[PDB]
Design a protein around this ligand. Structure first.
Ligand SMILES: O=P(O)(O)OC[C@H]1O[C@H](OP(=O)(O)OP(=O)(O)O)[C@H](O)[C@@H]1O
Ligand SMILES: O=P(O)(O)OC[C@H]1O[C@H](OP(=O)(O)OP(=O)(O)O)[C@H](O)[C@@H]1O
Ligand SMILES: O=C(O)c1ccccc1O
Ligand SMILES: O=C(O)c1ccccc1O
Ligand SMILES: [Mg+2]
Ligand SMILES: [Mg+2]
Ligand SMILES: [Mg+2]
Ligand SMILES: [Mg+2]
Lengths: 346, 346
């Protein structure tokens, strides 16, 4: 294989042969690709329209190179809540808030995340401002998960060989297929997830990658453009269960949610977004809470799907009940406090 | 303007706004673009499908930055004979041989060229092997043109600010829109040419760029893949005259040319290809001579097109007669000897 061969095939608008995307990603991950080659590959793949097979190869290479968690430290039913980012709408950190609530409901959460790329504050930035340690290595993440019920895998700490690709992503500035890889490369490899996709025409490809792994996952795109389950309108959901993908339209009004305006979900810098986390966890009513509860419930539904006996509507009602109770009893607020203390106590 | 704006527009499969391609190329020509940005741009433009407006912007910027020839040193009727290269068929240097014969017939030739990229020996490599000075500056090319009837503009000598783009083209090694720019950026700006295009679906775009300049040009693509008029089969010609483009198919059998096999046109390293030039100019009959006479006649037809009185069949008959006579009288052989002497006597 070679760059001229692979890039030529993509510019001819042809799908790659089996193993070609993997070869490319591995060249990229070993410091063996020129920045120009990395860029051409990212752009060419994006414009051809990447297939699930191709994206799965990219993600697989990344997972091969990632720092893994220690054997037997990740519960079989661990869940992630994370999105591509890049929806362009500056919101509060919905996935991060949802993840805390989910953990507090008793679902183990190993969250993958990163700093902002185009937003004012990313999940990692907001966690840092809350006093949560985002610098933890494999062993300490495993301990966080066991002792607190949640662990945070900071993308740059677990994927050091992605350095070169990350740099090129920053330089070119446009979204590419690389923007899909974060949610697909959690180093703890959880089998369930609520996965947000900002790019409506690539969400089905992300869902195909999860289906290949037989994950129980909801890939979500709010019909307003959010990489989260939205409260402002319907959301498209690509449901992954039993190795197949199901596309459906989701309306939170069907569960009693009131239509919000995007303005109401608006965020700020790390300090502002941290304050919004404390506000929700302290029981504050309103649009932000509603959005947090809905997404927390979505992750609980994904967790439920790890069993083939899970039914859609009863799963959602249970998810909503559990998410609401985890906040209302103060369990979510206490969990955050316990998470902060854990990192301080080394 | 910005890289994210421009690259995003391209990845959304949209034509650029007027001036955006020019902004991009200017950034690239001023050393202000990262290699990743250069590559993303070249690739994204290629996969979107470039327009003549866009390619015309890129070439315009390059021509802005190029060393010009001194005022009033290029005859109004000078012609170029040059191709994109990249046909991936190792042939003798047909454009370069054609250019010598055309100059010997008395049509002023200011030829743009470069060393090999893909092939064993490019036009510049073969001229060097023949003893021709290939890297003369503006004043000396002007003198060569006046005194010998032909001048050669070496792309790296006249387009020094293209070095970063050139480097990226080499690194990524798949053709992009940049592969079109050589024949479109002759620094002497001759108004006529025989212009080869290896890429069947980009030839019409090249022709549109020349149309916008009101050049008299035949853009040619051999139906066997050659970026020259072939003798093995038909060629597609995009004829540019009076600011418009006419698509034609051309069959040299209509002018008495026997079919050749492509291996009959095969070349080798610069020494071999130099020997091939000497063989044709010394009156050797055979397939190489036929392909040379045909291409020289094409260039003479383009020159004739600078008049609105030019008629297609008479022009080809005159071109063929003039090209053959220039070889047979020994004028083409003598012009090469004189060109070699000129460079030695500077
Ligand atoms: O700056 P952007 O490109 O828009 O990305 C915003 C955030 O979205 C992703 O994380 P995640 O879903 O985990 O964070 P969230 O809590 O902000 O939803 C990404 O890692 C960023 O942290
Ligand atoms: O290595 P490649 O990418 O295939 O390019 C082969 C040659 O074709 C172009 O020139 P030109 O048309 O002047 O050369 P020619 O005499 O070989 O036809 C290009 O400048 C190279 O010199
Ligand atoms: O975004 C990443 O995952 C990353 C990884 C390694 C180095 C820098 C980075 O931004
Ligand atoms: O090929 C070119 O035009 C070129 C131009 C400047 C520097 C190096 C180069 O190869
Ligand atoms: Mg999110
Ligand atoms: Mg989001
Ligand atoms: Mg040529
Ligand atoms: Mg050629």
């Amino acid at each position: 294989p070679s760059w001229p061969q692979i890039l030529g095939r993509l510019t001819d608008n042809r799908d790659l042969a089996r193993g070609q995307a993997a070869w490319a990603m591995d060249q990229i991950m070993t410091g063996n690709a020129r920045p120009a080659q990395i860029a051409a590959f990212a752009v060419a793949m994006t414009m051809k329209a990447p297939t699930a097979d191709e994206v799965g190869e990219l993600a697989g290479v990344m997972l091969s190179h990632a720092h893994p968690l220690p054997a037997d430290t990740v519960p079989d039913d661990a869940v992630d809540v994370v999105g591509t980012g890049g929806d362009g709408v500056n919101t509060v950190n919905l996935s991060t808030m949802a993840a805390i609530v989910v953990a507090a409901a008793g679902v183990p959460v190993v969250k993958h995340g990163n700093r902002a790329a185009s937003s004012l504050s990313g999940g990692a930035d907001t966690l840092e401002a809350l006093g949560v340690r985002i610098d933890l290595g494999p062993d300490l993440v495993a301990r966080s998960l066991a002792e607190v019920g949640i662990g945070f895998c900071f993308a740059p700490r677990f994927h050091p060989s992605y350095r070169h690709a990350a740099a090129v992503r920053r330089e070119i500035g446009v979204p590419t297929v690389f923007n899909l890889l974060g949610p697909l490369t959690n180093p703890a490899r959880p089998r369930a997830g609520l996965i947000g996709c900002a790019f409506a025409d690539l969400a089905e490809v992300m869902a195909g990658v999860f289906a290949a792994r037989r994950s129980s996952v909801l890939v979500v795109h709010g019909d307003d453009g959010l990489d989260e389950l939205t409260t402002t309108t319907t959301s498209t959901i690509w449901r992954v269960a039993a190795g197949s993908v199901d596309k459906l339209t989701f309306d939170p009004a069907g569960f009693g949610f009131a239509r919000a305006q995007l303005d109401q979900l608006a965020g700020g810098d790390a300090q502002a977004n941290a304050a919004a986390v404390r506000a929700v966890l302290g029981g504050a009513r309103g649009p932000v809470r509603d959005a947090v509860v809905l997404n927390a419930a979505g992750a609980i539904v994904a967790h439920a799907g790890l069993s083939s006996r899970a039914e859609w509507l009863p799963a959602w009602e249970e998810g909503l009940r559990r998410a609401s109770a985890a906040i209302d009893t103060g369990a979510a607020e206490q969990l955050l406090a316990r998470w902060v203390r854990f990192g301080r106590q080394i």
